[PDB]
Amino acid sequence: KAYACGLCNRAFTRRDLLIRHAQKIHSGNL
């Protein structure tokens, strides 16, 4: 769905923001 981190609930306009977020906040998707 719309670029929205179901983890922090955060949502961005771009995906990169969503990605870098996972690699920033949840730094780790493994």
Q: Least distance to Zn ion from the beta carbon of 30, Å?
A: 15
Rank residues 5 and 17 by Cβ distance to Zn ion and give the closer one.
5
1-30: which residues touch Zn ion (CB under 5 A)? 5, 7-8
User: Is the separation of the CB atoms in 3 and 14 below 8 Å?
Assistant: yes
Per the CB < 8 A criterion, the answer to whether 3 and 15 are in contact is yes
Task: Tell me how far, at minimum, the Cβ of 12 lies from Zn ion, in Å.
Answer: 10
| Closest listed residue to residue 4, CA positions, set 25, 21, 27 | 21
The residue ranges that bind Zn ion (CB under 5 A) are: 5, 7-8
